[PDB]
Amino acid sequence: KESRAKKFQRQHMDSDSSPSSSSLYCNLMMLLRNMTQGRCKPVNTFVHEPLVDVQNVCFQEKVTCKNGQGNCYKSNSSMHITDCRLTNGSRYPNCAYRTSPKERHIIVACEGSPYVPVHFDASVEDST
Numbered sequence: 001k002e003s004r005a006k007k008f009q010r011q012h013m014d015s016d017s018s019p020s021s022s023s024l025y026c027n028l029m030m031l032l033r034n035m036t037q038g039r040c041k042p043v044n045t046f047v048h049e050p051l052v053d054v055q056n057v058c059f060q061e062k063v064t065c066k067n068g069q070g071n072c073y074k075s076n077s078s079m080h081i082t083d084c085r086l087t088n089g090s091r092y093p094n095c096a097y098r099t100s101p102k103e104r105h106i107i108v109a110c111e112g113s114p115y116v117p118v119h120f121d122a123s124v125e126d127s128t
Ligand SMILES: [Cl-]
Pocket: 078, 079, 080
């Protein structure tokens, strides 16, 4: 059983690994984080920063969520992330992923007390 904040950490936090993800990173991480259980999660972003730095985004720039609902926030700084995208050829339970490391501002939806990330909304290159 899992809280929204915990699900966010499981799906999106990778604090203790290198930023420049190897080509196998997504294959391994999507498996290890249970995102290939039941189905291949089609796309997923991991954030290679300290948990506190990501949580602090909840107190940074308030921006509109992609679906116009909830409370989203954009990081002041560009963060190390990795996008994982399910390969066209993959079919569950064979879940293969292309790994794309980049540095981007993250946009997360925050909620609760404490007020913490519960949804990875988007990433964008530009500051402001
Ligand atoms: Cl950084």
